[PDB]
Structures are given as C-alpha cells and as structure tokens.
Amino acid sequence: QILPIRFQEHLQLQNLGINPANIGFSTLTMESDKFICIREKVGEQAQVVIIDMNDPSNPIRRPISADSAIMNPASKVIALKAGKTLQIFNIEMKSKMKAHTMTDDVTFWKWISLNTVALVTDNAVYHWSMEGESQPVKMFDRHSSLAGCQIINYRTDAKQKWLLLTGISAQQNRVVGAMQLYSVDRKVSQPIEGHAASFAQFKMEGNAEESTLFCFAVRGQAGGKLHIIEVGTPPTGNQPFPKKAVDVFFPPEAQNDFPVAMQISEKHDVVFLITKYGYIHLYDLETGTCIYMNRISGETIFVTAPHEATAGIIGVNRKGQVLSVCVEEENIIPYITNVLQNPDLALRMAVRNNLAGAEEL
C-alpha cells in the first residue's frame, strides 16, 4: 500500500552516549530541528550535551550550573537559567550576550522566534527580545483556569498579536488541557479547553492577504475535536475564513490517549497531530478533513519541532529515537483519490500545493 506520509529515523541518542535517564521533557530540549540539548550529571559535574543535527556524530559536552538550557532555533546561541538568573551565550564566541535577574522563578520558557525567548512564571508571560538592551516585557497575566497546571507549551502567530499558553492537570482521572488565548491588540484573554495548538498563515483563493489561523485539538468528554478558526479582523478586502470543527478519533483501546503536539506545514497546508501514546494524524488545514491516521509506536514523543527540510515534524521519544514525519509528495494525491476516495480534496490539494497525481482521477 502507498502511504500519504513518510517516516525517517535521524538518530538514536543512546548511540551518542546519552543516558536514557536524561531523555525526558525537563532535561532534553529541541527548540528547532538544528540542535538537541541534554542536561546530564556525569559524576559531580552538571553538563549540557549539544547535538548539532548537521554534525550529530560529534556532541560537545560543557560544564553548567543551569537548571534549564534552550538553544536558539537558528544560531549556536544558548539560553541558560538557574532560578531567577537568566543568561544568553554565543557558544562560538564563548561570550555572554545578555543577562537578566527575574523577580519570579521561570517555570517554562522557549524560543518563539529567531530573536525572542518567551518566559512563563507562576502568574505571567514575558517576551525577551535579544535585540540591543531589551529586558523581558510582560505580555499578559496568567488566567486562573491554568492555576496549578503543568505548563507544556506557548505559541504565537507570525506577528506576535495572538499568544497561546497551554497547561494540563489531572481532573476526573484524565489529563485535561487548559489554554489561554491572549489578544495583544484587544488586551483580552479567552480560556479554552485544548491539548495541542498552532497558528498558521493561509491565503484563501480570491483573497489578496493571508488569513491568521488558530488550530487546536482537544479530547473533551465531548470526544476528540480539531478547530481551525481565523483570529483577528480579516485584512480589508479579504473574505473571512470559515470556521472548521472536525472529530479527532481515538480507538477504544486508547481511552486514556490525548493530543500532545501539532505542527502545520505551510508548504502542504496540512496539520500533523501527535497523541501522547504514539498515534499520528494528518488533517487538511483548509477544511479540517482527516487524511490519515496510524500508530507510530507505544512510545511518547515528548518534544517536537518543524522539520524544515520536508515541511514536516521532527521529535524525540523516551528511547532517544529522533524521528521525522512528512507528506510523501508522490503518494498523497493518489492516496486521497484512491484510498480516501475523495477526488474533490485530492484535486484541490494537487493545484493548491503543486503536487502530482490529479491528472488521473
């Protein structure tokens, strides 16, 4: 059978001398497909291990006293913290670029762009530009709906006008997602039940300007749902993007499963969704139509990034497998025509994203 996606194993971190005890959410970071950082204690000495994905054979270990390390998405620039102490280093320059002392512990942080670090404290969210003498600026106060959640993600639209904070907690013996969507222009927060989310830019045919889309997936008691919604006033002259809501299927033996990660391909206009217990889903961004579901593994993929090369998703599982999934550009249109029997979707996707196979419907 032809599959509309392709899997690829890039690395086993245990073949690089990474101890499996350090392959987890709190100790391994992958902020982009260019680097993986792992904090390890070897003897008495805390180290950071930096894997250059363009040179994976030669990890470099450096001593640290940081509780958290996140590499810049594009440059060998690393953000380190220990409690309230934040430091930015250019590794190649062996130089401290910037430092700041917070008045609150940072419980979650990540790079939201090439030049900005987002910081989450117990009660607020900050952006920290690496430009000039910029210090962290508060973006919004955390909503009470996320109080006592484990913060697992933070994302923004391209223009940093829509901000989304995601926490989870145990309620009624399931993992319940609490999201806060903040409008920077309107200064309004919306609490939303959700597990995974991304923003995307999408130009509707007949529109001169891109639409800003907010895509989120949730397992409620209502069952699995994926939502694709335009945020903000449509650009002048644009038609509005019509809201989509579709089902997210969980089989009977995965009654405890829930979405953990989402990446949107702007090349293919598809949504990749990964569940906690190793299901992969592919949805059309325009309509929400489910294209494909299958099981990767039992294994939790606990961190993901965009895979630039393939317009796909790359992740690491608890075994230390670095795995990517992308659209199979040669099979997806035949797969949608023949296996899904959806010649409409097939033909739309074939001309929208310039793919082969809708000559033969």
Binding site: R62, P63, I64, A66, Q87, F89, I91, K94, K96, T101
Partner: peptide
Amino acid sequence: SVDLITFD
C-alpha cells in the same frame, strides 16, 4: 553572578 556555562 557567575557564568552558568564554562568554555574551553
């Protein structure tokens, strides 16, 4: 406040 990383 000391460097949180040590180089060569």
